[PDB]
Amino acid sequence: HSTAETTLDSFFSRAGLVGEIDLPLEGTTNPNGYANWDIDITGYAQMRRKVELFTYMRFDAEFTFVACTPTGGVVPQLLQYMFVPPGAPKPDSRESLAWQTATNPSVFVKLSDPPAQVSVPFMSPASAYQWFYDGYPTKDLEYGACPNNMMGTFSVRTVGTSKSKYPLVVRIYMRMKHVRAWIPRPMRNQNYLFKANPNYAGNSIKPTGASRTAITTL
Amino acid sequence: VAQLTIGNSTITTQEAANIIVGYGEWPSYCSDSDATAVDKPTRPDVSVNRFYTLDTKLWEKSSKGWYWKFPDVLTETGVFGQNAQFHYLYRSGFCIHVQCNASKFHQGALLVAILPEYVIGTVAGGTGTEDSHPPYKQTQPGADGFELQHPYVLDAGIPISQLTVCPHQWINLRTNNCATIIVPYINALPFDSALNHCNFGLLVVPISPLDYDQGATPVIPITITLAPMCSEFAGLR
Amino acid sequence: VAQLTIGNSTITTQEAANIIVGYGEWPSYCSDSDATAVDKPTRPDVSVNRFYTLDTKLWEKSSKGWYWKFPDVLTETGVFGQNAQFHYLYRSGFCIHVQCNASKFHQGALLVAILPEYVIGTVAGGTGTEDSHPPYKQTQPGADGFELQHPYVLDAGIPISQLTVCPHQWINLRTNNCATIIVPYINALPFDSALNHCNFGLLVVPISPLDYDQGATPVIPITITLAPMCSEFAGLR
Amino acid sequence: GFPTELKPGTNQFLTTDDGVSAPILPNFYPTPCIHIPGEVRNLLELCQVETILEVNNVPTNATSLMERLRFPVSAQAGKGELCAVFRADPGRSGPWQSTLLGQLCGYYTQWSGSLEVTFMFTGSFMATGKMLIAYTPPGGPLPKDRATAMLGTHVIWDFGLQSSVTLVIPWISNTHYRAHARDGVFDYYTTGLVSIWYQTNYVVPIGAPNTAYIIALAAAQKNFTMKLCKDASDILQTGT
């Protein structure tokens, strides 16, 4: 019965899959053996609903990178995951001098080696992130969108001058730690429409939960 | 809001409204003398001390009222039903808790009371010429209770106009809903049968008829939850 | 004569013959550290601590011997069978007691022993070319045990000529009958599954063949009675 | 070199396991946190907040969902009539799903504690009468009629007097494991049963609304627990 499983850190812990990069040898998606992933903790489906229980949050995260082949095979390919601190520019080519700039923390690891993990501190220049922003950050509709909440950008890529020899799939897991929440708000009860705002189906409004026949009949 | 949790049960009842303790006595076990002096009666503290929530009855603009008979009501469903069936002698206090889920757009008043040795009496035929002692349905109405046919005379020629002279509590919708009564063991014997003699009866009558402007759920659910305080049994079978 | 009574059971076993305590350790609960540190494992002292008396096996002039697998043997019959089924993790010591009802006109000797992680191995086909891991009948032979097919190699290429290197006790008819062994929890994990991994096996083989001059009951009953010492479980389902 | 032997679990990644790993930005000093009013430290704080219990969870129509918040009482109903009835199942589907308590439980596998439903009469001021709220612990089906219902724990509520009564549910334990179709979730079993009855008919003077509504507010008591996490959430994030 220990009320410890109901804390905030015990509610928001656990490494969840938030990203899945894909470097097919040949095809459409990521045709340059590299891709840019913007840290988005909603990469985990049911996470949005959860964090959105509060108005202000603060936390750190431990990202883990489980990469393999689509088959699930291990291969002797060396990778480089780079981190783009919100504010610095991201790579655009397979050798944009971006991967070169030190102020962009990179971490080389082979697929042979166990998953790579690193910790991103609470970025935001604010006191805390905030899932809601009732205004405009002083043409276009810039409502509800809160600026400084950007945690950064991970840029995965196969080390080396030439393309990779095998197809690769990098899965990105992130567990948030040391959490502080504020201003609890009602629990979402209408399906989500966009990752952006809280819009909902303006006719397809369903009841918070299942319904019955008569109020007297159980 | 504050949910009481005594057993594998968890009723989310009000924080602590007003409860009428019956005849001013908390049900207790026993000193050291009974209908068994060389027979130390085991006191079920195990699963015999949890919350039981009887099938909610629906209150209509026309309900005449209902009643249950203790200890019978539970000898049915429950591990307390297990005890009352496999044991000879019995002594146990109680604690009933009647709740009413309705809206501020409804209205009514329920008189909830405990009446020791509640002996029923049917029509006695039709007009009054048949010594027909009420069915085994009115003497022990299981855990689903039974309806009053003549609420005014409580089915026993006694006027309900005076029922308040028993441990009672009112449930006026515009003022509350939950009502509680702690019943102590009331009998002319320390240890009595828990299967044939019903120590008492719980009545719950609509004194001020239920009502609602048309369009509101017409039936308000009355949820009776009870807890066996200080069960006692002697000799198993 | 003196009958031990620990539970709603009452075995009329000898006063107090000799019992071999396994690996020299009385089965106990646990210090304060396990496969559960924020999960205080409830310790069934209720009906999980009584006497169980397995269906007596009949010893013939030809019985090859029998064996049971713990904790499996009881996950079947019993409230200890209730626990082992509705719980995830498990840790429990034991205490087996094998009795033999025979007359001074019979003769034989049984080697009774406890062998941790008793992994069986069938014929492997017939001559030896089939990686057929023994049936679900030899890995967990319920509460009725299972017979050895090759007593000499205990069904696992190990010589019984050396089985005494385990907690054992002899049962020579001309000298006794009842034999006892207290088994402590032996595992490479504090809390292990009580449904898939069998902490050990109890063997009971006729080393000196049963015999009787013609005319005596040819089958001597071997009664195995056991008591779960210090049961422990974690998280119900 | 100092002697080491590696134990199983080496090179292993456990999603729950929480040791550590270096900071991607060593010298970064995360803008200090200032003071934000009303911080939460344990969801259980929330589980004790009263939230509207949709006891009247019948109208499903789109433009009626607002009625689910309250049930009604009126002149049409006569003494004894059963007004409404629901179960003490903070977890499971039903009227509790509207409450914050309920919604949180869904994010948990098992629990136990005492509950606390409150009933608010919103009728006229001139309205009077008695309603009989009654709880029937697990087992004993919903009382046959009002009478028998009263012989067990109940509370006669009188709005003529106090315009808001609170009922305490002793204890509900959603721990009695089960295995329905395939969703072997620890089924309540311990479904208490709250029923509200018309103790007296609805009484009002000439000039007042001959029908009122009652709002229900639930919440768990102090002694509430929650064990095991379950991210069951039908409302999921969708890519634009």
* DSSP codes of every residue in C130-180: ------TTTS--GGG-EE-S-GGGTTTT--GGGGGGSSEEEEETTT---EE
Half-sphere exposure of C57 (CA within 13 A, CB side): 22
* Nearest chain A alpha carbon to D97: A209
CA-CA-CA-CA torsion for C188, C192, C195, C201, nearest 10 degrees?
30
**Using CB atoms and an 8 Å cut-off, which of residues 82-111 of chain B contact chain A?**
none
Contacts of D215 (CB under 8 A, 6+ apart): B103, B104, D52, D69, D70, D119, D120, D122
Q: Strand C66-70 and strand C200-212: pairing?
A: antiparallel
What distance in Å separates residue B170's CA from the closest CA in chain A? 22
Distance CA(B152)–CA(B160), nearest Å, equals 6
**What is B104-146 written as a DSSP string?**
EEEEEEEEEEEEES------TTSSS-------TTTS--GGG-E
A1 touching B (Cβ < 8 Å): no
Distance CA(C138)–CA(C115), nearest Å, equals 15
- Strand intervals (E) in C12-119: 19-21, 52-53, 57-59, 66-70, 87-90, 96-100, 106-116
CB contact under 8 A, A192 and D235: yes
B144 touching A (Cβ < 8 Å): no
Residue A100 burial (CB count, 10 A): 11
Which of A10, A105, A195 faces D240 most closely, judged by CB atoms? A195
Six-digit token string for B149: 């046919």
**Using CB atoms and an 8 Å cut-off, which of residues 131-190 of chain D contact chain C?**
175, 177, 184
Distance CA(B214)–CA(B209), nearest Å, equals 15
* Nearest chain D alpha carbon to C86: D177
Tell me how far the alpha carbon of residue D4 is from its chain's centroid. 54
Distance CA(B77)–CA(B47), nearest Å, equals 12
D218 touching B (Cβ < 8 Å): yes
CB contact under 8 A, B97 and D90: no
Domain range for C82 is 1-237
Distance CA(C189)–CA(C91), nearest Å, equals 9
Residue B156 burial (CB count, 10 A): 15
Interface C–D counts its CB contacts (< 8 A) at: 5
Which of D180, D190, C155, C190 is CA-nearest to residue B9?
D190
Distance CA(A68)–CA(A113), nearest Å, equals 11
Residue A28 burial (CB count, 10 A): 7
Which of A86, A76, A88 is CA-nearest to residue A160?
A76
B125 touching A (Cβ < 8 Å): no
Distance CA(B181)–CA(B161), nearest Å, equals 20
What distance in Å separates residue C209's CA from the closest CA in chain D? 47
For residue B55, list chain A residues with Cβ-Cβ distance below 8 A.
218
Distance CA(D19)–CA(D11), nearest Å, equals 13
User: Which contiguous run of DSSP H or E holds residue A63?
Assistant: strand A54-68
D18 neighbors A119 (Cβ within 8 angstroms): no
The alpha carbon dihedral of C180, C184, C187, C191 has a sign of positive
- Per domain, the residue ranges of chain A are 1-218
Half-sphere exposure of A1 (CA within 13 A, CB side): 11
Which of D194, D79, D71, D199 is CA-nearest to residue D131?
D199
Enumerate the β-bridge partners of residue B112.
Answer: B169, B204
Tell me how far the alpha carbon of residue A19 is from its chain's centroid. 6
What distance in Å separates residue A52's CA from the closest CA in chain D? 12
Q: How many distinct structural domains can be found in chain B? A: 1
* Nearest chain A alpha carbon to D232: A46
Residue A84 is classified by DSSP as -
D133 neighbors D167 (Cβ within 8 angstroms): yes
Six-digit token string for D9: 């679990």
Q: How far, in Å, are A90, D69, D122, D147 from residue A95 at the CA level?
A: 11, 60, 70, 84
Domains of chain D are 1-240 (2.60.120.20)
Question: Residue D38, SS3?
Answer: coil
B204 neighbors B98 (Cβ within 8 angstroms): yes
Rg of chain B over all Cα atoms, to the nearest angstrom:
18
Distance CA(A42)–CA(A48), nearest Å, equals 5
Q: How far, in Å, are A123, A147, C56, D28 from residue A103 at the CA level?
A: 15, 22, 78, 11
Distance CA(A197)–CA(B201), nearest Å, equals 59
* Nearest chain B alpha carbon to A216: B219
What burial class does residue B119 get, using C-beta atoms within 10 Å of its C-beta: 0-12 exposed, 13-18 middle, 19+ buried? middle
* Nearest chain D alpha carbon to B107: D202
What distance in Å separates residue D4's CA from the closest CA in chain A? 19
For tokens 């002039």, name the residue.
C61
Amino acid symbol at A187: M
Method: cryo-EM
Q: How far, in Å, are A79, B164, C143, C237 from residue C89 at the CA level?
A: 41, 56, 21, 11
Long-range contacts formed by C28-34: CB under 8 A, 24+ apart? C28/C93, C28/C184, C28/C230, C29/C230, C29/C232, C30/C91, C30/C190, C30/C232, C33/C190, C34/C91, C34/C190, C34/C191
Distance CA(A39)–CA(A30), nearest Å, equals 18
CATH number assigned to the domain covering A1-218: 2.60.120.20
Which of B51, B73, B69, B99 is CA-nearest to residue B224?
B99
**Using CB atoms and an 8 Å cut-off, which of residues 45-104 of chain B contact chain D?**
50-70, 73-74, 76-78, 81, 95-104
CB contact under 8 A, D237 and A195: yes
The alpha carbon dihedral of C143, C149, C153, C158 has a sign of negative
* Nearest chain B alpha carbon to A218: B56
Distance CA(A124)–CA(A133), nearest Å, equals 14
B163 neighbors B156 (Cβ within 8 angstroms): no
Distance CA(D196)–CA(D71), nearest Å, equals 11
Distance CA(A191)–CA(D240), nearest Å, equals 12
B221 touching A (Cβ < 8 Å): yes
Amino acid symbol at A132: F
For tokens 């010893």, name the residue.
C59
Interface A–B counts its CB contacts (< 8 A) at: 15
CATH number of the domain encompassing residue B109: 2.60.120.20
What distance in Å separates residue D8's CA from the closest CA in chain B? 40
Q: What is the distance in angstroms between the CA of the first residue and the CA of the last residue of chain B?
A: 44
D170 neighbors D183 (Cβ within 8 angstroms): no
Which of A14, A127, A173 faces D31 most closely, judged by CB atoms? A127
Distance CA(A59)–CA(A100), nearest Å, equals 29
For residue D16, list chain C residues with Cβ-Cβ distance below 8 A.
none
D165 neighbors B223 (Cβ within 8 angstroms): no
CB-based burial, D25-56: b 16+ in 10 Å, e otherwise? beeeeeeeeeebeebbebbbebbbebbbbbbb
Tell me how far the alpha carbon of residue C114 is from its chain's centroid. 7
For tokens 């003071």, name the residue.
D35
CB contact under 8 A, C237 and D175: no
CB contact under 8 A, D82 and B219: yes
D66 touching A (Cβ < 8 Å): no
C92 neighbors C190 (Cβ within 8 angstroms): no
